């Protein structure tokens, strides 16, 4: 695959093959996703995630394939449920407050207790020796904890590398280096796998000075291309939505 | 028919009995040699129960003749597993399946 | 749940804070672009880019003009920043006029004058919040009779040959509503039976009253200051292949509204005393009539012979007779 | 000095980007200014979230989660295209949402989730697909119509929310009205349920909605049913099975809680008399045998198998005579509903007086008397020991005479002493004696 | 001409139709990307008006009639036999121009692409022809992208025909793009199309490129370079042993590689021949190397199962004794003193031989070469050096 950098026709054909792989399983086709798990395996996916010398087109196609196989369905369902604010009234909901401590300081977004109703995350093991057809429901299972640590480490290295403005970015361009990685982080964050200190550290990566909990230039001031700026905008949109949800829960608590 | 050849010897005395869950790592490839399934890729062992018609027939009978700790190669004819319609997308019609199976633990 | 809803429309909806002028100032301020490495012509300001986006979206041809929440927000923001609203001193009034002129300058220097016409043209004569916000923005930037923006609008119309602008203006003007006696009777029956009315203001009668006043205020501010060129160009679009008579359509709408007012009088002829519902309906209709009369007067001021002849041969005398009868009988 | 707040940081960043570079991406500019507007309008988020906000009980949290999962399945199957397995999934999810008790307990949450709009959207997609070549997936169409009808019955506010799509439903009224066993599962029934027993909605109902139904009814009178004659039913010039549904909808529109909405009734009767072809071959006025003769010939149709039946799963058999008789009964019932109240006539309102004059001109009293004079057949015990039943869906039925009596009481007026006993003799006494004769337990 | 009328009598305006086709292509040409937004909008309005007028006058059907009248003849030589030689020369160009003109007329117009739904079935029937495959594919791509009804009208046979084209005409990305457009249109996915594309294309594993992770395999050899030549002073029989101190079956998802045996060099160069330098290849993957993994005899990248007392893959604490005979070409093995009955025979000897071990990560093995460096656990076979 690393040799394919100089075979342009093979590179283009394989990139469009990956696009076809995404298209066939697009929009929650769980049976097609399970079938594609046989062709594109988890170790191949992760190695494509991690490899620096990967061609940009293949790297983007592989992140897209991973997201569309495992992650897209739950991401879309939770995005559809984002706008609604069905909140049970229990003791935790009563304990919810607008401000954490006595002084009026906003806590880190997403950090805290959220007792609003959420969709249930279900996954199925991709096994082709079992006959039970119930596996064709739900998305195929992926090691989300490994993926999260993988992602945070790669994002930290990318933030460190790009500010140097080196002439050898991963994938050959800053766009190829950042757009797919930030897309994957967006997908994970929409799912809400990120919890506690992981969210704290990656918000620090987004902006050190503003999100310091109690030099290096952040992803906001890193002088980004336009698509990367659009993904930054999406991340900030999610942060503001989390702020609004916390506000609504505290309002109900007072109510 | 299912043919079993030994890759690594097992205990040789205890065998999978009815009413038990078999914990195995299997790697499935077609007769050409192209891999289509592997539990080692997912890093989770496969659990299945004897006689419950939850796994393919050849992989059932071949595992039934193995031993604890034994690594063996299981060759399944098309008739015993995915007979003629095949598995849509993964297995072509009328294909012979080879499985490298290791009986990790009986429970 | 009831407390949540009541709290919403009792406190959160009523809460008001003013930020429009500050936002427009910050957007219009060029943020040290010459200190920035431009290596070319000075880059456009964020407000200029926002107006350019809103202009390109309107310029893009569609079957119908879709609703853009960003537009309904930012057009309102710009209108509020454009107007920002015992007897004041003369210098106080002149300073207020100069400040309003500078506020309109911030907007119409960027292209809002062309965008407000492009949006109306793309509207294709369909009444909606998009058109209402565009009309309010036009009124805000045209307040006081600003000859510069009037010239910009006229030049843009003559250079692009927008028949669609006047076609949509006409279509909206037929789409405007009047008093509805049947709807008023239905509302009265519901109120008498005691079932709670879904609408607080009874706006089934005179469906849109702010929209009509805004449209005619726009058509009047377009002709304020005795702007003879635009007055003639409204009646006759010399350059365009097709010409539409906004002057005649205005008097047609005046005839319809006077017919509605006369019918509503004939309804309240038998009753000894007029109820508060009918009184507010009369007030809204009389205000609409005042706006139409003012628009017609601004059309015919500055001995505009063509407009005077057109309204002379139009159906104005019938509406005038109807108003005379209604006035003689109300007093 | 750090911004110290996310809103301030974003407000600085976004304007800084815009003033640093000319953005060539329309979507980038869109997102930029949307985010800036959100930051400087924090009240907007609250005023958009609070209507969507709901509070639920911990005991019902689980059932709420199940209902939400079903709603999400339906929402995703909206995005996917429509097929057979998608229809099965729609049916199953709709059934689950029915069976969920939170659906009944909290209709306000149901509105806040916008579920009726979701069902509306999927029904619009399926109706748009294959518009000229007959509605495909009529089973799921019926499921969606039943869901929308139940939503109306849940609460009054749901009826008011259902009302705003009455225009589309009336446009798509003619979907499966001809097909039997689909009754109560059509967009016309959805509109009828939206306007049912809601006087506020009946008053808010506009004239064009009525005249559209009037035009449909006139078409059903001039033109035969195509797919009935396609299955081979004997060709008659008009379409009673289609006409009766519109007549029932007009009844629901004009008559509400025992009182006749005069403002709707006047408009309906004016449209009906302006298009005289809505009445039928009996009430043509030109060469019409009359209502009495029409029902006598319809009874003869009922005895003759070739003239009642198609004569080329039981629901496919549409008894033509029974359909015609039901059509005329429904028309008479609608006119009786449109008849004004007695207190207004005592007051002497000229409009109501002339409405009664028009109704009397349309329907002679003799036809009404004759229809009641007609008697029906007695189910009889046989030699073996079995009582033979004439068809309930074919032949004379009591509701047909109930509509006649309703019209007679609401329009003509029973205040003549000798006319009352004449009506008794001609039509009430035989019926009472038949009721007394069927009083044995087997006939009971 | 099809009626077999005389060619001289028939008038066939080849030059005029070619010039008019070029003019029509230029007249329906899409706008330039460098133009400003206003000019773009004016040009799109004009192009849409032209497309609508042409469709309402039904010029597309005329184009289809011309295309069919051209396809009645098989090839350019056949058309040159029937019509004039200039017509035969320009036949392919005219056909391509007409197909591109149809594509240009259908691009971006939903009404035209919806009216092409009926004609779609006839269009697919000519896809296999080499003279029009690209044009038909482009037209199909435009129709499928623009029209959803065109997407619904596609059937199982029409979706197999595209895969058959991909197979017969070689790998091409435009076929993949058309298949992608088939799956999802305007954010709406056709589940049946997705299922058919999967179940027909994917299971074969013969057209699309196949990918998998494989462990790196490295080979260690000693300095000795022994060979056989006519009238040469080299002993013909050699022997050495391998000692496996530690091996791990699965360091990763793939099995650990461990093969031992002999390899030969191309000619007399000291460079190993017939194999690659870096990758997953080891001893036995070419005709030059001869290997043994404890269960299979490896040569030419083909494995043959060989019986042994207590058959097992190479474990910890195993001694592999390898024997080489060059007078009679024979490579024989013996595991832990138990001899295997598999032997490589009658192989090329015009090269230098050397011991070699191929492995992947997770090994601990020792070369027992005898003498000073090591000693042999078992006695060497008689006559072996």
Q: What would the DSSP string read from start to end of D9-57?
A: HHHHHHHHHHHHS----HHHHHHHHHHHHHHH-HHHHHHHHHHHEEEE-
Q: Between β-strands D53-56 and A85-88, what pairing exists: parallel, antiparallel or unpaired?
A: parallel
Q: Is E370 exposed, middle or buried (0-12, 13-18, 19+ CB in 10 A)?
A: middle
Q: Report the alpha-carbon angle D28-D32-D38, nearest 5.
A: 145
Point out which residues pair with E332 in neighbouring strands.
E323, E343
Q: Rounded to whole angstroms, how far apart are CA atoms D133 and D175?
A: 11
- Positive/negative CA dihedral, A119, A121, A124, A126: positive
For chain A, give the secondary structure using H, E and C: CCHHHCCHHHHHHHHHHHHHHHHHCCCCCHHHHHHHHHHCCHHHHHHHHHCCCCCHHHHHHHHHHHHHHHHHHHHHHHHHHHCCEEEECCHHHHHCCCCCCCCCCCCCCCCCCCCCCCCCCCEECCCCCECCHHHHCCEECCCHHHHHHHHHHHHHHHHHHHCCCCCCCCCCCHHHHHHHHHHHHHHHHHHCCCCCHHHHHHHHHHCCCCCCCCCCCCCCCCCCCHHHHHHHHHHHHHHHHHHHHHHHHHHHHHC
Q: Rounded to whole angstroms, how far apart are CA atoms A179 and A173?
A: 10
Contact criterion met (CB < 8 Å) for C70 and D33: yes
Cβ within 8 Å of residue E92, ≥6 positions away: E76, E131
Q: Rounded to whole angstroms, how far apart are CA atoms D273 and D171?
A: 22
Contact criterion met (CB < 8 Å) for E188 and D83: no
Q: Rounded to whole angstroms, how far apart are CA atoms D428 and D373?
A: 8
Which structure tokens are listed for A194?
A: 């990120």
Cβ within 8 Å of residue E270, ≥6 positions away: E225, E352
Mutate: best of B7, B29, B73, B99, partner E, most E CBs <10 A? B7
What is chain A's alpha carbon radius of gyration, rounded to the nearest angstrom?
20
Q: Rounded to whole angstroms, how far apart are CA atoms A52 and A56?
A: 10
How far from C13 is each of C5, C80, D87, D109, CA to CA, in Å? 11, 18, 42, 21
D/E Cβ contact: 3+ pairs below 8 Å:
yes
Q: Is C302 exposed, middle or buried (0-12, 13-18, 19+ CB in 10 A)?
A: middle
Q: Rounded to whole angstroms, how far apart are CA atoms D209 and D203?
A: 12
Question: How close, in Å, is residue D224 to chain E by CA atoms?
Answer: 31
Of C232, C243, C231, C253, the residue nearest C315 (C-alpha): C253
- For D335, the 3-state DSSP assignment is helix
Contact criterion met (CB < 8 Å) for D55 and C1: yes
**Neighbour-count burial for A8-24, b at 16+ CB within 10 Å, e otherwise:** eeebebbbbbbbbbbbb
Q: Which entry of B7, B11, B15, B26 is annotated as an active-site residue?
A: B26
**Neighbour-count burial for D274-305, b at 16+ CB within 10 Å, e otherwise:** ebebbbbbbbeeeeeebbbebbebbbebbeee
Q: Is C311 exposed, middle or buried (0-12, 13-18, 19+ CB in 10 A)?
A: buried
Q: Rounded to whole angstroms, how far apart are CA atoms C179 and D244?
A: 36
Which structure tokens are listed for D375?
A: 């008697």
Q: Rounded to whole angstroms, how far apart are CA atoms D291 and D288?
A: 8
Q: Rounded to whole angstroms, how far apart are CA atoms D76 and A27?
A: 8
How far from E318 is each of E219, E331, E364, CA to CA, in Å? 19, 19, 11
- For B66, the 3-state DSSP assignment is coil
Q: Between β-strands B35-38 and B21-30, what pairing exists: parallel, antiparallel or unpaired?
A: antiparallel
C2 in D contact zone (CB under 8 Å): no
How far does CA C263 lie from the centroid of its chain? Answer: 26
* Helix or strand run (H / E) with residue B29: strand B21-30
How far from D169 is each of C83, D163, E26, CA to CA, in Å? 45, 10, 48
How far from C273 is each of C121, C180, C276, C277, D197, CA to CA, in Å? 46, 20, 10, 12, 34
Which structure tokens are listed for D122?
A: 């999927």
Q: Mark residue C125 as left, alpha or beta (left: phi above 0; alpha: psi -120 to 50; beta: remaining).
A: left
* Helix or strand run (H / E) with residue C161: none
Look-up of token digits 């009529």: D138
Which structure tokens are listed for D231?
A: 């299955």
Q: Nearest by CB to B55, which of A31, A125, A131?
A: A131
Of D103, D73, D98, the residue nearest D85 (C-alpha): D73
Q: Between β-strands A85-88 and D380-381, what pairing exists: parallel, antiparallel or unpaired?
A: unpaired
What is chain C's alpha carbon radius of gyration, rounded to the nearest angstrom?
23
Look-up of token digits 């309008």: D41
A27 in E contact zone (CB under 8 Å): yes
Calculate the CA dihedral of residues C182, C188, C194, C195 and round it to 10 degrees. 30
Cβ within 8 Å of residue C114, ≥6 positions away: C55, C152, C153, C156
How far from D1 is each of A103, D9, D252, E141, CA to CA, in Å? 19, 11, 69, 56
Count of alpha carbons within 13 angstroms of residue B18, beta-carbon side: 3
Of C59, C65, C196, the residue nearest C127 (C-alpha): C65
| Ramachandran angles phi, psi of E220, nearest 5° | -110, 135
Look-up of token digits 């399983």: A25
Q: Rounded to whole angstroms, how far apart are CA atoms E348 and E346?
A: 7
D18 in C contact zone (CB under 8 Å): yes
For chain E, give the secondary structure using H, E and C: CCCCCCCCCCCCCHHHHHHHHHHHHHHCCCCCCCCCHHHHHHHHHHHHHHHHHHHHCCHHHHHHHHHHHHHCCCCHHHHHHHCCHHHHHHHHHHHHHHHHHHHHHHCCCHHHHHHCCCCHHHHHCCCCCCCCHHHHHHHHHHHHHHCHHHHHCCCHHHHHHHHHHHHHCCCCHHHHHHHHHHHEECCEECHHHHHHHHHHHHHHCCCCCCCCCCCCCEEECCCCCEECCCCCCCCCEEEEEEEEEEECCCCCCCCCCEEEEEEEECCCCCCECCCCCCCCCCCCCCCCEEEECCCEEEECCEEEECCCCCCCCCCCCEEEEEEEECCCCEEEEEECCEEEEEEEECCCCCCEEEEEEEECCCEEEEEECCCCCCCCCCCCCCCCC
Cβ within 8 Å of residue A175, ≥6 positions away: A56, A225, A227, A228
Calculate the CA dihedral of residues A43, A49, A53, A59 and round it to 10 degrees. 110
Count of alpha carbons within 13 angstroms of residue C43, beta-carbon side: 21
| Ramachandran angles phi, psi of B19, nearest 5° | 85, 40
Mutate: best of D23, D53, D65, D85, partner A, most A CBs <10 A? D53
Are D25 and D18 within 8 A, CB to CB?
no
* Helix or strand run (H / E) with residue D381: strand D380-381
Are D240 and D324 within 8 A, CB to CB?
yes
Mutate: best of E181, E185, E211, partner A, most A CBs <10 A? E211
Which structure tokens are listed for B27?
A: 């790697």
Are E261 and E296 within 8 A, CB to CB?
no
CB < 8 Å & 24+ apart, contacts of D371-377: D371/D291, D371/D292, D371/D295, D371/D400, D371/D401, D371/D404, D372/D401, D372/D404, D372/D405, D372/D423, D372/D426, D372/D427, D372/D428, D373/D426, D373/D427, D374/D292, D374/D295, D374/D296, D374/D299, D375/D430, D375/D431, D375/D434, D376/D434
Q: Is B32 exposed, middle or buried (0-12, 13-18, 19+ CB in 10 A)?
A: exposed
Which structure tokens are listed for D59?
A: 């005991």
**Neighbour-count burial for E324-334, b at 16+ CB within 10 Å, e otherwise:** bbbeeeebbbb
E180 in A contact zone (CB under 8 Å): yes
How far from C235 is each of C174, C216, C248, C304, E80, CA to CA, in Å? 17, 15, 8, 11, 67
Are E342 and E324 within 8 A, CB to CB?
no
B35 in E contact zone (CB under 8 Å): yes
Using a CB-CB cut-off of 8 Å, the residues of chain C touching A251 are 4, 7
Q: Rounded to whole angstroms, how far apart are CA atoms D8 and E238?
A: 82
Of D215, D145, D225, the residue nearest D186 (C-alpha): D145
Q: Nearest by CB to D79, which of E188, E190, E192?
A: E188
Are C77 and C23 within 8 A, CB to CB?
yes
Which structure tokens are listed for A191?
A: 């799912």
Q: For chains D and E, what is the number of CB pairs under 8 angstroms?
A: 14
Point out which residues pair with E345 in neighbouring strands.
E330
How far does CA D60 lie from the centroid of its chain? Answer: 34
Q: Which entry of B56, B59, B91, B100 is annotated as an active-site residue?
A: B56
Q: Rounded to whole angstroms, how far apart are CA atoms E370 and E323?
A: 13
Using a CB-CB cut-off of 8 Å, the residues of chain C touching E44 are 61
Calculate the CA dihedral of residues E155, E158, E160, E166 and round it to 10 degrees. -150
Within 10 Å of residue D350's Cβ, how many Cβ atoms?
Answer: 7
Q: Is C69 exposed, middle or buried (0-12, 13-18, 19+ CB in 10 A)?
A: exposed
- Positive/negative CA dihedral, C48, C53, C54, C59: positive
Helices A72-82 and A174-191 meet at what angle, rounded to 10? 60
What is the rounded end-to-end Cα distance, in angstroms, of chain E?
87
| Ramachandran angles phi, psi of E330, nearest 5° | -160, 125
A16 in E contact zone (CB under 8 Å): yes
Q: Rounded to whole angstroms, how far apart are CA atoms C167 and C120?
A: 10
Q: Between β-strands D259-260 and A85-88, what pairing exists: parallel, antiparallel or unpaired?
A: unpaired
Largest CA distance in chain E: 100
Count of alpha carbons within 13 angstroms of residue E379, beta-carbon side: 3
* Helix or strand run (H / E) with residue C29: none
| Ramachandran angles phi, psi of A54, nearest 5° | -65, 145
Q: Nearest by CB to E202, which of A19, A26, A39?
A: A39
Are E237 and E362 within 8 A, CB to CB?
no
- E strand map for chain C: none
Is B91 an annotated catalytic residue? no
Using a CB-CB cut-off of 8 Å, the residues of chain C touching A252 are 4
What is chain D's alpha carbon radius of gyration, rounded to the nearest angstrom?
29
Which structure tokens are listed for C164?
A: 């669609």
Are B67 and B15 within 8 A, CB to CB?
yes
Of E219, E213, E348, the residue nearest E271 (C-alpha): E219
Helices A174-191 and A144-162 meet at what angle, rounded to 10? 140
What is the rounded end-to-end Cα distance, in angstroms, of chain A?
59
Q: Which entry of B37, B46, B48, B100 is annotated as an active-site residue?
A: B37
Contacting partners of chain A (3+ CB pairs under 8 A): B, C, D, E
Q: Rounded to whole angstroms, how far apart are CA atoms A147 and A157?
A: 15
Tell me which DSSP letter residue B55 carries.
B
Helices A226-254 and D26-40 meet at what angle, rounded to 10? 30
Of B28, E189, E145, E174, the residue nearest A33 (C-alpha): E189
Look-up of token digits 């200039």: E86
What is the rounded end-to-end Cα distance, in angstroms, of chain D?
93
Which structure tokens are listed for B95?
A: 């294909």
Point out which residues pair with B87 in neighbouring strands.
B91
Cβ within 8 Å of residue E287, ≥6 positions away: E274, E299, E300, E347, E348
Q: Give me the resolution in angstroms, 1 decimal.
A: 3.5
Q: Between β-strands B97-106 and B21-30, what pairing exists: parallel, antiparallel or unpaired?
A: antiparallel
Q: Between β-strands A139-140 and A123-124, what pairing exists: parallel, antiparallel or unpaired?
A: parallel
How far does CA E258 lie from the centroid of its chain? Answer: 29
Cβ within 8 Å of residue C100, ≥6 positions away: C82, C83, C84, C143, C144
Is B48 an annotated catalytic residue? no
Look-up of token digits 């400003």: E36
D433 in C contact zone (CB under 8 Å): no
Are C85 and C20 within 8 A, CB to CB?
no
Tell me which DSSP letter residue B5 carries.
E
Is B59 an annotated catalytic residue? no
Please name the residue of chain A whose CA is at the shortest distance from the CA of residue C7. A255
- Positive/negative CA dihedral, D394, D397, D401, D403: negative
Which structure tokens are listed for D256?
A: 């509400």
Of A176, A97, A87, D327, the residue nearest C4 (C-alpha): A87
- Positive/negative CA dihedral, D115, D118, D124, D127: negative
Q: Rounded to whole angstroms, how far apart are CA atoms A198 and A185?
A: 12
Mutate: best of B57, B90, B91, partner A, most A CBs <10 A? B90
Q: Which entry of B7, B36, B41, B79 is annotated as an active-site residue?
A: B36
């Amino acid at each position: 695959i690393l040799e394919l950098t100089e075979q342009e026709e093979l590179l283009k054909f394989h990139y469009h093959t990956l696009r076809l792989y995404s298209a066939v399983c697009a929009l929650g086709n769980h049976r097609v996703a399970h079938a594609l798990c046989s062709h594109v395996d988890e170790p191949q996916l992760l190695y494509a995630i991690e490899n620096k010398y990967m061609p940009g087109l293949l790297r983007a196609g592989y992140y897209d394939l991973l997201i569309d196989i495992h992650l897209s369905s739950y991401a879309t369902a939770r995005l559809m449920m984002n706008n609604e604010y069905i909140v049970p009234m229990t003791e935790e909901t009563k304990s919810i407050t607008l401000f954490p401590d006595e002084n009026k300081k906003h806590g880190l977004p997403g950090i805290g207790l959220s007792t609003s109703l959420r969709p249930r995350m279900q996954f199925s093991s991709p096994s082709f020796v079992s006959i039970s057809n119930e596996c064709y429901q739900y998305s195929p299972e992926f090691p989300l904890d490994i993926l999260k640590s993988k992602t945070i480490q790669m994002l930290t290295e990318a933030v460190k590398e790009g500010s140097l403005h080196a002439r050898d970015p991963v994938g050959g361009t800053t766009e190829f280096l950042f757009v797919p990685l930030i897309k994957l982080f967006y997908t994970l964050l929409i799912m809400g796998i990120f919890h506690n200190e992981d969210l704290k550290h990656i918000l620090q990566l987004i902006e050190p000075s503003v999100f310091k909990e109690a030099p290096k230039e952040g992803l906001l001031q890193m002088k980004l291309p336009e698509p990367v700026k659009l993904q930054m905008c999406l991340l900030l949109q999610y942060l503001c939505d989390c702020q609004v949800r916390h506000r609504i829960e505290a309002i109900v608590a007072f109510s | 028919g299912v043919e079993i050849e030994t890759i690594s010897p097992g205990d040789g005395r205890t065998f999978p009995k009815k009413g038990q869950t078999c914990v195995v790592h299997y790697t499935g490839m077609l007769q050409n040699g192209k891999k289509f399934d592997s539990s080692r890729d997912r890093n989770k062992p496969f659990k299945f129960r004897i006689g419950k018609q939850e796994v393919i027939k050849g992989f059932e009978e071949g595992a039934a003749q193995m031993s604890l700790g034994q690594r063996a190669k299981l060759t399944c004819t098309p008739d015993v597993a995915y007979g003629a319609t095949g598995h849509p997308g993964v297995i072509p019609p009328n294909a012979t399946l080879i499985f490298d199976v290791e009986l990790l633990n009986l429970e | 749940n009831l407390f949540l809803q009541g709290y919403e429309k009792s406190w959160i909806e009523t809460e008001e804070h003013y930020f429009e002028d500050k936002l427009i100032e910050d957007l219009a301020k060029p943020g040290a672009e010459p200190p920035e490495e431009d290596e070319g012509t000075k880059r456009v300001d964020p407000l200029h880019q926002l107006i350019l986006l809103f202009s390109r979206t309107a310029l893009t041809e569609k079957c119908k003009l879709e609703e853009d929440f960003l537009y309904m927000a930012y057009a309102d923001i710009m209108a509020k920043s454009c107007h920002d609203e015992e007897v004041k001193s003369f210098e106080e009034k002149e300073m207020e006029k100069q400040k309003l002129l500078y506020q309109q300058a911030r907007l119409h220097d960027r292209g809002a004058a062309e965008m407000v016409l492009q949006t109306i043209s793309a509207s294709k004569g369909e009444t909606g919040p998009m058109v209402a916000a565009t009309l309010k923005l036009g009124i805000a930037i045209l307040n006081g009779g600003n000859s510069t923006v009037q010239q910009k609008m006229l030049d843009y119309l003559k250079e692009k040959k927008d028949v669609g602008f006047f076609q949509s203006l006409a279509g909206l003007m037929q789409s405007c509503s009047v008093l509805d006696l049947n709807a008023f009777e239905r509302q009265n029956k519901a109120e008498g039976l005691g079932m709670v009315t879904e609408e607080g203001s009874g706006e089934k009668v005179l469906q849109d009253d702010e929209f009509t006043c805004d449209l005619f205020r726009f058509l009047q501010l377009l002709c304020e200051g005795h702007n003879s060129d635009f007055q003639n160009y409204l009646r006759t679009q010399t350059g365009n292949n097709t010409t539409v008579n906004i002057i005649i359509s205005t008097v047609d709408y005046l005839l319809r509204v006077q017919e509605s007012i006369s019918d509503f009088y004939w309804y309240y002829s038998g009753k000894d005393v007029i109820d508060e519902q009918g009184q507010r309906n009369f007030s809204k209709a009389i205000q609409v009539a005042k706006q139409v009369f003012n628009t017609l007067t601004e059309y015919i001021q500055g001995p505009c012979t063509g407009n005077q002849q057109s309204l002379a041969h139009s159906r104005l005398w019938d509406a005038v007779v109807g108003f005379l009868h209604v006035f003689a009988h109300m007093q | 000095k750090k911004s110290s707040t996310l809103q301030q940081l974003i407000s600085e960043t976004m304007v800084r980007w815009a003033q640093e570079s000319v953005i060539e991406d329309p979507e980038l500019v869109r997102a930029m200014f949307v985010l800036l507007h959100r930051q400087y309008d924090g009240i907007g988020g609250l005023v958009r979230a609070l209507p969507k906000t709901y509070t639920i009980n911990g005991v019902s949290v689980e059932d709420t989660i199940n209902l939400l999962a079903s709603l999400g399945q339906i929402r995703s199957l909206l995005s996917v295209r429509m097929g057979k397995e998608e229809e099965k999934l729609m049916i199953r999810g709709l059934g689950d949402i029915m069976n969920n008790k939170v659906f009944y307990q909290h209709p306000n949450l149901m509105r806040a989730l916008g579920m009726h709009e979701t069902v509306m959207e999927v029904m619009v997609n399926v109706l748009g697909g294959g518009e000229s070549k007959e509605i495909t997936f009529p089973k799921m169409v019926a499921n969606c119509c039943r869901f929308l009808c139940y939503f109306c019955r849940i609460s009054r506010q749901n009826q008011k929310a259902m009302f705003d799509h009455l225009s589309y439903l009336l446009e798509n009224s003619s979907v499966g009205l001809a097909s039997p066993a689909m009754r109560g599962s059509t967009p016309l029934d959805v509109a009828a349920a939206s306007v049912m027993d809601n006087n506020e909605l009946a008053l808010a109902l506009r004239e064009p909605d009525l005249e559209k139904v009037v035009r449909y009814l006139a078409g059903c009178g001039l033109q035969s049913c195509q797919m009935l004659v396609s299955k081979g039913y004997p060709d008659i010039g008009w379409n009673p099975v289609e006409g009766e549904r519109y007549l029932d909808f007009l009844r629901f529109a004009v008559f509400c809680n025992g009182e006749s909405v005069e403002e709707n009734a006047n408009v309906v009767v004016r449209l009906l008399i302006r298009r005289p072809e809505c009445f039928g071959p009996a009430l043509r006025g030109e060469g019409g045998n009359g209502l009495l003769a029409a029902m006598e010939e319809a009874i003869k149709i009922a005895e003759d198998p070739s003239r009642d039946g198609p004569s080329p799963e039981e629901d496919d058999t549409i008894h033509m005579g029974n359909a015609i008789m039901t059509f005329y009964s429904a028309l008479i019932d609608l006119l009786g509903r449109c008849a004004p109240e007695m207190h207004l006539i005592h007051a002497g309102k000229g409009e109501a007086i002339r409405i009664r004059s028009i109704l009397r001109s349309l329907i002679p009293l003799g036809d009404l008397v004759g229809v009641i004079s007609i008697a029906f057949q007695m189910p009889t015990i046989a030699k073996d020991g079995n009582v033979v039943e004439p068809d309930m869906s074919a032949g004379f039925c009591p509701d047909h005479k109930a509509a006649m009596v309703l019209f007679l009481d609401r329009v003509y007026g029973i205040e003549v002493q000798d006319f009352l006993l004449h009506l008794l003799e001609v039509g009430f006494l035989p019926d009472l004696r038949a009721a007394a004769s069927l009083d044995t337990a087997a006939l009971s | 001409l099809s009626k077999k009328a005389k060619a001289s009598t028939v008038d066939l305006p080849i030059e005029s139709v070619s010039l008019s086709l070029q003019d029509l292509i230029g007249y329906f040409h899409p706008p330039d990307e460098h133009l400003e937004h206003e000019d773009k909008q004016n040009r799109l309005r004009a192009l849409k008006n032209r497309q609508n007028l042409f469709q309402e006058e039904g010029m597309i059907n005329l184009v289809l009639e011309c295309i069919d009248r051209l396809h009645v003849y098989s090839s350019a030589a056949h058309f040159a036999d029937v019509a004039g030689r200039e017509a035969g020369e320009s036949w392919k160009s005219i056909l391509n121009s007409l197909y591109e003109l149809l594509a240009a007329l259908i691009r971006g117009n939903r009404k035209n692409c919806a009216q092409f739904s009926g004609s779609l079935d006839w269009l697919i029937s000519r896809l296999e022809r080499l003279e029009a495959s690209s044009g038909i594919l482009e037209v199909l791509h435009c129709v499928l992208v623009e029209s959803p009804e065109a997407l619904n009208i596609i059937k199982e046979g029409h979706i197999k025909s595209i895969i058959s084209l991909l197979d017969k005409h070689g790998r091409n990305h435009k076929v993949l793009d058309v298949l992608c457009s088939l799956c999802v249109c305007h954010g709406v996915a056709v589940r049946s199309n997705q299922h058919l594309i999967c179940d027909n294309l994917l299971p074969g594993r013969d057209l699309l490129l196949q990918t998998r992770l494989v462990n790196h395999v490295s080979s260690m050899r000693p300095n000795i370079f022994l060979g056989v030549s006519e009238g040469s002073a080299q002993y013909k029989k050699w022997y050495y042993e391998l000692m496996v101190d530690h091996t791990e079956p699965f360091v990763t998802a793939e099995a650990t590689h461990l093969r031992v045996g002999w390899a030969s060099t191309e000619g007399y160069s000291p460079y190993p021949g017939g194999g690659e330098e870096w990758g997953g290849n080891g001893v036995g993957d070419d005709l030059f190397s001869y290997g043994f993994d404890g269960l299979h005899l490896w040569s030419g990248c083909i494995a043959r199962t060989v019986s042994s007392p207590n058959q097992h893959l190479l474990r910890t604490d195993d001694v592999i004794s390898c024997c080489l005979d060059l007078s009679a070409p024979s490579i024989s093995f013996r595991i832990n003193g138990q001899p295997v009955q598999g032997m490589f025979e009658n192989f090329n000897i015009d090269g230098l031989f050397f011991p070699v071990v191929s492995f992947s990560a997770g090994i601990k093995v020792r070369f027992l070469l005898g003498g000073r460096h090591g000693e042999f656990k078992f006695l060497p076979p008689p006559g072996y050096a």
